[PDB]
């Protein structure tokens, strides 16, 4: 009936993850959602809690799978999955610490006896969750509060953010520098760039390659509190040359809209 | 004839890099070294400098890094980076422990008309012809770049002595672990040790628990990379671990700091390895 307001869309790209794990700390529940075309749908849910031995919230991806004998069953159960904590939003504010894993624990031990901020589930549960996880790809969203909205409200929020992404893509493809610039925060950073050098490079590229095409696959879209994360397979065509890459934008709320603070690209 | 005191050995493991890049800030030189068995051999050398732009002590980071990604146009501007850039893993685990990290470090080029020092603060900058030559030696994710304010060149005799000294340290650690001599093994670790999921106490408790269950283990290490510079020691090896229950192979990286006349491990990483 209802859908999580902060998970708006799962990417259609099959090299990414068709599943997203959503941890609702207030409900003590971990849910698995799957793409259904442009829609999302809940597949399953399990009890979960946060280790207690404020805890972080954020938008993460699962990276590695660990088990015995590398990690002790007494602390982690049969399996642990690491995350990319601290992410770029976390680093922007110098967040560090022991890290965030999704892991299990012995049956005799409460889930809250896990290490602080880790997501802890039962040993039987982690073995089932492993089947949904594509290492390096599957998101894990860890939120204090999850607002559930009607399907019609969810569709509206998704379309609102889809229009934001499209207006950005269009301004980029048009090489309409004046419009494109407005999507970026003056504190923007990317590897090798600040706001000024990023815009200067975009203007210089336009001077060399007048016509470009930018295509974005149906993206992951997550929007929780101030944060917006969009991840897509991007096709860039310019000067009869082409490249495909994984494009991730990180943005923060700015008045009634958002401004991009970080932009990443990796070859695909 | 002389050899850099800080680069003691290159790993024999072909999944890693047989080449190491060494940057000597004082001499404004970048050299390529290649593994020759247990020895190292300098194969080429070019001018290089450190970028000074957009940086009060006026100094730039130094350390023991690995090259990660290769970038070129149209992703990055030629005006700033010339024909190619290679990113690093800066800040590494040593840098994170010191918690005074700055702007990123790349190895890149620049237009022919401008000085190498126009690069951004701390980057290693070379000419366009040079960066294209270096690309032939760089294995992404594997090739070290050692960025040192100063380089101490020593005799081959002195170099081999230092290499053997550190090899004996590593072997002593390996033997203590393999013997599951917990008293001896513990002496190799700093009390502030951390690894993913562990501190000193939980690391030692896990090792003691494994010992209680699996009486005899085997630990084998491929000939390691060994770098020792300033307070830091980095050892990287392909490790085979065997108990009666399982065998695993993985990449083992040890980060250690000087302690009196020896070293204590502050971080220890393992990543699984497979051919198949
Ligand atoms: Br796709
Ligand atoms: Br991928
Ligand atoms: Br619940
Ligand atoms: Br800030
Ligand atoms: Br944490
Ligand atoms: Br159990
Ligand atoms: Br419980
Ligand atoms: Br898995
Ligand atoms: Br499944
Ligand atoms: Br939500
Ligand atoms: Br304009
Ligand atoms: Br960044
Ligand atoms: Br908006
Ligand atoms: Br891009
Ligand atoms: Br030249
Ligand atoms: Br040296
Ligand atoms: Br660590
Ligand atoms: Br942990
Ligand atoms: Br290990």
Author numbering:
A (entry chain B): 29 to 81, 92 to 306
B (entry chain A): 29 to 83, 89 to 309
Original paper wording:
Bdellovibrio bacteriovorus HD100 is a small, vibrioid-shaped predatory bacterium that invades and then replicates within the periplasm of Gram-negative prey bacteria, forming a spherical structure called a prey bdelloplast. The protein, Bd1075, generates cell curvature in B. bacteriovorus by exerting LD-carboxypeptidase activity upon the predator cell wall as it grows inside spherical prey. Bd1075 is targeted to the outer convex cell face by its C-terminal nuclear transport factor 2-like (NTF2) domain, where it exerts localized LD-carboxypeptidase (LD-CPase) activity upon the B. bacteriovorus PG wall to generate curvature and the classical vibrio shape.
The structure of mature Bd1075 protein was determined to 1.34 Å. The Bd1075 structure contains two domains: the catalytic LD-CPase domain (aa 47–180) and a C-terminal nuclear transport factor 2 (NTF2)-like domain (aa 196–304). Interestingly, although there was a global agreement in the fold to Csd6 of H. pylori and Pgp2 of C. jejuni which also contain an NTF2 domain and an LD-CPase domain (the junction between the two at residue 188 of Bd1075), there were significant differences in fold elements and local regions. These differences resulted in an inability to solve Bd1075 via molecular replacement, necessitating the use of SAD phasing with co-crystallized halide ions. We were able to trace residues 29–308 with the exception of a presumably flexible region (aa 82–91) which we term the active site ‘lid’. Bd1075 has a consensus active site, with the superfamily conserved catalytic triad consisting of C156, H141, and A142, each present in the expected (presumed active) orientations. The termini of Bd1075 are very different to both Csd6 and Pgp2, replacing the N-terminal dimerization domain of those enzymes with a simple, shorter loop, and extending the C-terminus such that the Bd1075 NTF2 domain finishes with a longer beta-strand (aa 295–306)—residues of which contribute to its binding pocket. Most noteworthy within the core of the Bd1075 C-terminus was the presence of W303, which is clearly located within the substrate-binding pocket of the NTF2 domain. The crystal packing of Bd1075 was such that a two amino acid loop of P107/K108 from one Bd1075 monomer packed into the NTF2 domain of the adjacent monomer. We postulate that its position has been modified in our Bd1075 structure by sidechains contacting the P107/K108 loop and may thus represent a ‘bound’ state.
